[PDB]
Amino acid sequence: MGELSWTAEAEKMLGKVPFFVRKKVRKNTDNYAREIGEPVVTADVFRKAKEHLGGLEHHHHHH
């Protein structure tokens, strides 16, 4: 047991990512959340991680 807690919110976004690059993101976020001090990777954490690694997507209006 050396993995963080992953929520359906974060995984729902990760499920939109091809299986061969899922590990690239998931492992990176695992290290990211630990770095910031978050045991549970949520949608917010994944969001911050994504922006940190490369948040080039533009969808600021979700509502």
- CB 20, CB 54: distance < 8 Å: no
Name the residue ranges covered by the structural domains of the chain. 4-55
| Residues contacting 12, CB < 8 A, separation 6+ | 43
- CB 38, CB 45: distance < 8 Å: yes
Q: Which fold has domain 4-55?
A: Helicase, Ruva Protein; domain 3 (1.10.8)
Residue 2 is classified by DSSP as -
The two tokens of residue 39 are 């045991």
For residue 18, the SS3 value is coil
Residue with tokens 């979700």, as numbered in its chain = 62
- State the Cα–Cα distance between residues 36 and 13, nearest whole angstrom: 20
